[PDB]
Amino acid sequence: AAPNFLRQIVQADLDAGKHAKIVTRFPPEPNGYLHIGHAKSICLNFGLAQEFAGDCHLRFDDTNPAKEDQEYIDAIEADIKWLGFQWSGEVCYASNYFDQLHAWAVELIKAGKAFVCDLGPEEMREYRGTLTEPGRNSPYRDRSVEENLDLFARMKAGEFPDGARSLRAKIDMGSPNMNLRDPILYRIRHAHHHQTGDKWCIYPSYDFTHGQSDAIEGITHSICTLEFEDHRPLYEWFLANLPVPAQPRQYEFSRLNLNYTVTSKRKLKQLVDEGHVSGWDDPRMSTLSGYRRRGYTPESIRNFCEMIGVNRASGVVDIGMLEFSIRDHLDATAPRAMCVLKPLKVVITNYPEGQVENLELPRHPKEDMGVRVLPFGRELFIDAGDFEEVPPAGYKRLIPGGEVRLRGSYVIRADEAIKDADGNIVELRCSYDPDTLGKNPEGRKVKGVIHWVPAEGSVECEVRLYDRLFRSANPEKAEEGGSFLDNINADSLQVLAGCRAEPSLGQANPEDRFQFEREGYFVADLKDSRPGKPVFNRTVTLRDSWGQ
Ligand SMILES: [Cl-]
């Protein structure tokens, strides 16, 4: 619903009679798992290309030599495919461009627009200056082209140890823009690269790789977050001073800032490494893997991204919007079922023992989704919460001598509560009114309707009740001497054993989603569900409990 300024930019080109296909890219570093914030970038880059029949590349920004790239490459590809998108052509890797990048660096040296600098980090930082205090030229800035070429070649050949010298662009140490103050282009690092192995011991900087990768790929619209807005002059400087094959243009959008959420790599790691969650794909984690395992649908995430739009204004999005999105999608699309979370045995005293009625309940109140068969008979389970000896005001379920409707079934009456030696109710003996199937009793009213399952045929199962991992809107903000862990929601997970699902749920497959009557929306966990024995995660409650 909200405006998307990039959509309007592309449409204006069309309105002006321009027919060039758009080419976007999603360019993550393969060094972390994606989170919900990345879904906005994914929906933006792939979605724009889809909308206008262009291309979106997947590019791994793998310029850094690291050991565990493949783990992250695989996970990132799986998230993108799960969201339903497809990159055009082959997967791209920034490391594929190392030869060309090095060639272009030599061109800058030859044009007197780059130099080899020997300054150590202390001097390098001191010479850099600040936004208010202008920097100083490196003492090596006036090296000859010949000397720069020789030193750079010797860097590439592996002559010097890590950090001994770097190649820098020669721009302006007095620039009000820090990125134009002779930025580093190459550093020495003797390290094995996941793609190119031991071939390189010089590696290019983010800025030297970024726009040049875009040009090589023929990117038309290079989309990044506002964090890199002040990099645009440098992005443009390289394109203006290199014989690049294309002139991609950079656009910046405001990142997704959800409340109640942590997305920072270091805090996520601590949550995982210290056992606050089960792993990176814990249903409470803001990872895309976590969101999937929670039961969110790709539709709900794409719908949410569409709803918040794309703009250049920083601002917080309430996580209730995302919770609404999955609520809305599952309300419309998910089959209904009954699962008794806290079972209480019920005996229908005037129901003939050994007899059964096979009631048929629609899987959806509106869609043509078939029926579930619910055997009704003498032995049932209801939720223990739906009977009270001493009811609170407004209570609408079972009380002693009182009635309740069983969903899609009969009106029953609580006639005797059986208690154990400790005073716990272990059985509720009820009568039913055989004239009430699909009919209200004549001359009296029944206040409430509850879910229920047959005792014989119910599926025993584990149900995990999930809620927000954090209980405050800005969890990273803590009191003096505290941390973000102080804001953890102690009620974020409740594991229930011995729940009683209707028989039809015995045929649930991993990732099947349901509305559990009067309880919420649930998914059969993709890892722990096995045939005949689902394990259910609560995806979201029926209605908002947190407010805003
Ligand atoms: Cl860098």
Beta bridge partners, 197, equal 193
Beta bridge partners, 57, equal 25
Beta bridge partners, 530, equal 533
**What superfamily in CATH does domain 334-341+459-544 come from?**
Ribosomal Protein L25; Chain P (2.40.240.10)
> In degrees to the nearest 10, what's the CA dihedral of 322, 328, 334, 336?
110
Per the document, the length of the chain is 548
Measured in whole angstroms, the distance separating CA 64 from the mean position of its chain's CA atoms is 25
Residue with tokens 């917080």, as numbered in its chain: 316
Q: What is the CATH number of domain 22-94+205-254?
A: 3.40.50.620
The gap between the terminal CA atoms of the chain, to the nearest Å, is 20
Does 40 show up as a binding residue in the annotation? Answer: yes
Measured in whole angstroms, the distance separating CA 456 from the mean position of its chain's CA atoms is 40
Q: What one-letter code names the amino acid at 128? A: R
> In degrees to the nearest 10, what's the CA dihedral of 270, 273, 278, 283?
30
Task: Tell me the structure's resolution in angstroms, rounded to a single decimal.
Answer: 1.9
Query: Could you give the residue numbers annotated as active site?
Result: 29, 255, 265
Q: In the numeric block, which tokens belong to residue 74? A: 């695989």
Beta carbons of 92 and 58 less than 8 angstroms apart: yes
Distances (CA, A) of 343 to 411, 455, 493: 19, 10, 20
Tell me if the domain spanning 95-203 has CATH number 3.90.800.10. yes
Does 256 show up as a binding residue in the annotation? Answer: yes
Q: By what method was this entry solved?
A: X-ray
* Residue 142 CB coordination number (10 Å): 11
Q: What one-letter code names the amino acid at 401? A: G
Does 509 show up as a binding residue in the annotation? Answer: no
Strand, helix or coil at 118?
A: coil
Residue with tokens 């068969």, as numbered in its chain: 373
Does 206 show up as a binding residue in the annotation? Answer: yes
Beta carbons of 383 and 341 less than 8 angstroms apart: yes
Does 110 show up as a binding residue in the annotation? Answer: no
Q: Where are the domains of the chain?
A: 22-94+205-254, 95-203, 255-333, 334-341+459-544, 342-458
Does 455 show up as a binding residue in the annotation? Answer: no
Distance between CA 305 and CA 315 in Å, rounded? 14
Instruction: List Cβ neighbours of 435 (8 Å cut-off, separation of 6 or more).
Output: 441, 442
Kindly give the pairing relationship between strand 425-433 and strand 411-419.
antiparallel
Q: In the numeric block, which tokens belong to residue 523? A: 């998914």
Question: Which DSSP category does 133 fall into?
Answer: S
> In degrees to the nearest 10, what's the CA dihedral of 329, 374, 431, 497?
-70
Burial call 164-189: b when 16+ CB within 10 Å, e when fewer: ebbbbbbbebebeeebbbbbbbbbbe
Helix axis angle, 36-51 relative to 298-308, nearest 10°?
80
Task: Could you list the beta-strand ranges (E) of 88-201.
Answer: 92-93, 114-117, 166-169, 184-188
Measured in whole angstroms, the distance separating CA 214 from the mean position of its chain's CA atoms is 26
How many angstroms does the Cα of residue 290 sit away from the middle of ligand 1? 30
Strand, helix or coil at 472?
A: coil
Beta bridge partners, 252, equal 224
Distance between CA 135 and CA 460 in Å, rounded? 70
Distances (CA, A) of 511 to 217, 296, 297, 506, 538: 37, 10, 10, 14, 12
How many angstroms does the Cα of residue 186 sit away from the middle of ligand 1? 9
Beta bridge partners, 221, equal 249
Does 38 show up as a binding residue in the annotation? Answer: yes
Instruction: List Cβ neighbours of 402 (8 Å cut-off, separation of 6 or more).
Output: 413, 414
Distances (CA, A) of 19 to 24, 52, 141, 349: 16, 10, 45, 76
The structural architecture, per CATH, of the domain 342-458 is Beta Barrel (2.40)
> In degrees to the nearest 10, what's the CA dihedral of 125, 127, 131, 133?
140
Distance between CA 157 and CA 200 in Å, rounded? 9
- Residue 354: is it exposed, middle or buried by C-beta count within 10 angstroms (0-12/13-18/19+)? exposed
How many angstroms does the Cα of residue 273 sit away from the middle of ligand 1? 27
Instruction: List Cβ neighbours of 258 (8 Å cut-off, separation of 6 or more).
Output: 36, 37, 286, 316, 317, 318, 319, 322
Q: Cα angle vertex 26, ends 20, 27, to 5°? A: 120
Q: What one-letter code names the amino acid at 365? A: P
Residue with tokens 């089959």, as numbered in its chain: 335
Tell me if the domain spanning 255-333 has CATH number 3.40.50.2000. no
Instruction: List Cβ neighbours of 17 (8 Å cut-off, separation of 6 or more).
Output: none
Nearest to 383 by CA among 339, 418, 417, 423: 339
Beta bridge partners, 469, equal none
Distance between CA 199 and CA 120 in Å, rounded? 25
Same fold, 334-341+459-544 and 342-458: yes
Beta bridge partners, 499, equal 461
Alpha helices (runs of H) in 203-297, residue ranges in sequence order: 206-217, 232-241, 265-273, 288-294
Beta carbons of 351 and 378 less than 8 angstroms apart: yes
Does 169 show up as a binding residue in the annotation? Answer: no
Beta carbons of 341 and 499 less than 8 angstroms apart: yes
Beta carbons of 179 and 230 less than 8 angstroms apart: yes
- Residue 419: is it exposed, middle or buried by C-beta count within 10 angstroms (0-12/13-18/19+)? exposed
Kindly give the pairing relationship between strand 221-225 and strand 249-253.
parallel
Write out the H or E segment, with its range, that includes residue 411: strand 411-419
Question: Which DSSP category does 287 fall into?
Answer: B
- Residue 547: is it exposed, middle or buried by C-beta count within 10 angstroms (0-12/13-18/19+)? exposed
Instruction: List Cβ neighbours of 187 (8 Å cut-off, separation of 6 or more).
Output: 163, 166, 202, 203, 205
Measured in whole angstroms, the distance separating CA 521 from the mean position of its chain's CA atoms is 18
Beta carbons of 87 and 57 less than 8 angstroms apart: yes
Distance between CA 426 and CA 387 in Å, rounded? 12
How many angstroms does the Cα of residue 473 sit away from the middle of ligand 1? 33
